Ligand binder design. Sequence first.
Ligand SMILES: O=C(NCc1ccc2ncccc2c1)c1cc(Br)ccc1O
Ligand SMILES: [Zn+2]
Length: 351
Amino acid sequence: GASKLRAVLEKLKLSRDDISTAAGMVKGVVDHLLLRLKCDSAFRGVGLLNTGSYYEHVKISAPNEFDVMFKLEVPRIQLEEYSNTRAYYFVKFKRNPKENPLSQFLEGEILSASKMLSKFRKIIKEEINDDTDVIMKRKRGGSPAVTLLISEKISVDITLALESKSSWPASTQEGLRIQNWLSAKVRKQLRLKPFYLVPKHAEETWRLSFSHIEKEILNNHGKSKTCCENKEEKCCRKDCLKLMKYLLEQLKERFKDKKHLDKFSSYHVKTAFFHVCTQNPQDSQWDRKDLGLCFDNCVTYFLQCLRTEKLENYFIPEFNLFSSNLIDKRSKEFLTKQIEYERNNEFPVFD
Ligand SMILES: O=C(NCc1ccc2ncccc2c1)c1cc(Br)ccc1O
Ligand SMILES: [Zn+2]
């Protein structure tokens, strides 16, 4: 049935909702950094993505790991697609006052991410010590750009994002195919919202970031406008996504000593999930009574994605998250066997 799945969801819920001093420490540090950053010539317009977002948790199993985004608005941005990759871009400028705030990171016409991250980090690294023990790490880098450690238990990833309030880039034109589930008029409202760019390479390239659209969908996710508001209309969409996320996290934990699962992340799980939401648009296909079957649909579909090596980005249709140049055949084959073993054994990572 669903009894074991429900107990896992309850355990995860109680440790999320449990009273904790962690959010208070995170806010104190974040507000510290933002007052310092706003005084610099380059970052005077920096601010938190969401107010009330001192507590975004990418890892559903680790309530002490926090994800925060700092945004900077770039008016009249010029995007140049990098190397037909559809999702990666150079950032240039229209330069109305050619001494725009980010002029100091220009290299020719192209905005240097690594230079901008350099000053961002250095400014945070000096402000860190001038209350609590805050330590940072220069490891990996990219996005998350800056990782802080509050006390011993609590970690905070800080990602710097550029914000543009112009129309989404053309690679997204045929994406976000929610018309038969959330409706065409909601797709239009969503695509009027700004988009974000975060640093990453496949050089000085940036990629589109849609976490804010994901959050909007998840908070208003039914075909019915009253889905999950009360009574006879309680669905299991959010629970299926939580269980998918926890499955991958537990598997990456179990096999961290091997390297094969290193490239997989919640992006792959979230993307496959929203594809199943498109496949199954009716709220009656997500009945709370059917949690077991619905989670199994999600698992089946994800496994189908691994075997065919095809997982189309939910926002950029021509971008295959599972292309062999991104994740090789042997790694997808390894995750396939591990998930099939979980499924055929009433999921032992949920013990
Ligand atoms: O698809 C997304 N963003 C674009 C993108 C492009 C290439 C990538 N390559 C590797 C890793 C992550 C990648 C993300 C997205 C989807 C959801 Br649901 C929530 C937030 C998102 O940002
Ligand atoms: Zn619902």
